[PDB]
Design a protein around this ligand. Structure first.
Ligand SMILES: CCCCCCCCCCCCO[C@H]1O[C@H](CO)[C@@H](O[C@H]2O[C@H](CO)[C@@H](O)[C@H](O)[C@H]2O)[C@H](O)[C@H]1O
Ligand SMILES: CCCCCCCCCO[C@@H]1O[C@H](CO)[C@@H](O)[C@H](O)[C@H]1O
Ligand SMILES: CCCCCCCCCO[C@@H]1O[C@H](CO)[C@@H](O)[C@H](O)[C@H]1O
Ligand SMILES: CCCCCCCCCO[C@@H]1O[C@H](CO)[C@@H](O)[C@H](O)[C@H]1O
Ligand SMILES: CCCCCCCCCO[C@@H]1O[C@H](CO)[C@@H](O)[C@H](O)[C@H]1O
Ligand SMILES: N[C@@H](Cc1c[nH]c2ccccc12)C(=O)O
Ligand code: NA
Ligand code: NA
Length: 441
């Protein structure tokens, strides 16, 4: 009685919907900014090609072969073997990541509400930066918008794969991309393009002699690809033998990278035209974008379109995050989909609440030494659980599978590409991750 994608394009568009969201605009911007731009970018692009694409194909393959959740897939394919630690850790990463993802997405709804009610058309007296700061440090206001976003997320997951997840509006992601392209072109004309483009594309290798940069690059590569937690195993598990995995993996990574690159071309020349520091941290785009819209005559209209379209993208990504614990709990405890979605969704919302508060009244609390609550949850989930899970997933196919199976189940043959793929999983990817972990600690 397991669900399957009803439509032929269902799978690839769902995988794409999962990947493209806040990580491409909000996260990519502030992480690229605080790590120095171009050298970080190049390391990130390297990781996408050589680690991301293979491990994406790996998740797809595992999931389609087992037709089960992130944990169940490992149990089914290799019962009594330790590999399932990856999926157990992924379920946990799912709780953690969605708990703060819903907070940032709630910031998005707040901004959308303000544009719609005419509030952010001109600069507030305290300025766009002052407006943002006052919002997020408010103890309760961000929580209301967060709860609102999670309700929407819970509802789609409760509805089902076919009736909910698959039924996204197909025009919204391509509209977001076009708007991003148009906005990138516009910020190129604002006066900071020479400096913003040099920050973004002209490497300074001095930054690379910090091992923190490599780990930030790999974390962002996993995060943006919806990777390492079994989210793509899960989506893959709803897929029939009528699907071509390698093409999907490449398309997902290519398109996700296009979005991030254009987002960067929008943001950094804008950062530089405004005189701001690119190291501004998580609120970077919430401070920059409204400034950019304000300089356009029809800018309030652009603002409405942007926050709507990014909101829809954050929504499809959030749904894929919630789908991981939901799928697992449905199987493991015979919970109904609606019951799992509501229960886990509320729990994850509440878990999210101290991360929201860390931007204000809890700003001085640490968990991991020196890191506030938000930064700690993100570090653990994105920089520890995701790359480790990815490593185990890579080793699993690479060393725990017969090669003929690995290739057949992934729609590859023992050609140059199949060989390249297998080499990635056995050695390149898991060793690069190992070396990043060892060096960064
Ligand atoms: C986006 C899709 C639509 C969703 C459904 C709409 C339902 C309507 C709910 C809106 C009610 C929220 O009300 C809220 O609005 C104002 C801001 O926007 C707040 O005003 C606030 O603005 C600042 C943020 O920078 C705060 O730090 C201030 O303490 C406060 O003055 C009100 O203190 C609050 O009560
Ligand atoms: C689908 C693609 C959409 C493309 C949109 C690009 C529009 C760029 C607008 O630039 C602005 O136009 C003024 C007049 O040309 C200049 O004086 C001003 O200094 C400049 O900032
Ligand atoms: C959509 C546009 C994409 C093009 C991006 C390429 C920009 C990266 C290089 O920057 C260049 O670095 C040199 C020294 O730092 C400067 O002499 C030069 O003036 C500057 O432009
Ligand atoms: C839309 C895609 C844009 C990506 C462009 C990537 C290449 C830009 C980097 O070139 C820069 O030029 C400098 C000038 O001397 C040199 O220092 C060095 O070669 C490099 O720092
Ligand atoms: C799909 C559409 C995307 C829209 C993004 C591009 C904005 C068009 C620019 O217009 C003009 O830019 C000047 C900038 O200084 C202003 O003088 C002027 O008042 C403003 O109207
Ligand atoms: N990839 C999405 C977020 C996301 C959805 N599902 C995931 C699973 C794991 C890690 C990240 C995600 C983004 O860039 O916004
Ligand atoms: Na992404
Ligand atoms: Na999305």
């Amino acid at each position: 009685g397991r669900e399957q994608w009803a439509s032929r394009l269902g799978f690839i568009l769902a995988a794409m919907g999962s990947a493209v969201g806040l990580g491409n605009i909000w996260r990519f911007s502030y992480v690229t900014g605080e790590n120095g731009g171009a050298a970080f970018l190049l390391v990130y692009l390297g990781f996408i090609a050589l680690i991301g694409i293979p491990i994406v194909l790996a998740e797809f393959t595992i999931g389609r072969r087992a037709q089960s959740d992130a944990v169940g897939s490992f149990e089914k394919l290799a019962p009594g073997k330790p590999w399932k630690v990856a999926g157990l850790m992924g379920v946990a990463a799912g709780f953690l990541i969605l708990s703060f993802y819903g907070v940032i997405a709630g910031w998005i709804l707040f901004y959308l509400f303000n544009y719609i009610t005419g509030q952010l058309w001109s600069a507030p007296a305290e300025g766009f930066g002052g407006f943002f700061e006052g919002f997020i440090a408010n103890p309760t206001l961000p929580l209301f918008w967060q709860a609102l976003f999670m309700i929407a997320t819970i509802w789609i997951v409760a509805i089902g794969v076919k009736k909910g997840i698959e039924r996204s509006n197909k025009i919204l992601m391509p509209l977001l991309g076009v708007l991003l392209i148009a906005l990138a072109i516009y910020s190129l004309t604002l006066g900071g393009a020479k400096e913003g483009l040099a920050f973004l594309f002209s490497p300074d290798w001095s930054a690379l002699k910090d091992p923190g940069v490599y780990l930030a690059a790999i974390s962002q590569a996993f995060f943006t690809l919806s990777l390492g937690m079994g989210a793509l195993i899960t989506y893959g598990s709803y897929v029939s033998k009528d699907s071509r995995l390698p093409g999907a993996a490449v398309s997902v990574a290519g398109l996700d990278t296009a979005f991030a690159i254009i987002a960067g071309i929008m943001i950094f020349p804008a950062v530089f035209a405004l005189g701001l520091s690119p190291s501004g941290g998580p609120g970077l785009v919430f401070v920059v974008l409204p400034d950019i819209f304000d300089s356009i005559r029809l800018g309030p209209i652009v603002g409405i379109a942007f926050f709507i379209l990014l909101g829809a993208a954050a929504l499809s990504s959030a749904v894929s995050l919630l789908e991981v614990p939901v799928a697992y709990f449905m199987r493991k405890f015979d919970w109904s989909r609606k019951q799992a979605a509501i229960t886990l969704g509320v729990i994850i919302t509440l878990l999210g609440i101290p991360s929201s508060l860390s931007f204000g009244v809890l700003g001085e609390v640490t968990i991991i030494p020196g890191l506030n609550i938000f930064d700690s949850v993100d570090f653990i989930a994105s920089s520890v659980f995701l790359p480790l899970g990815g490593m185990i997933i890579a080793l699993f196919i690479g060393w725990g599978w017969k090669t003929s199976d690995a290739l057949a189940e992934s729609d590859l043959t023992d050609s140059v590409w199949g060989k390249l793929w297998i080499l990635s999983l056995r050695f390149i990817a898991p060793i690069a991750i190992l070396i990043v972990f060892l060096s960064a600690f």
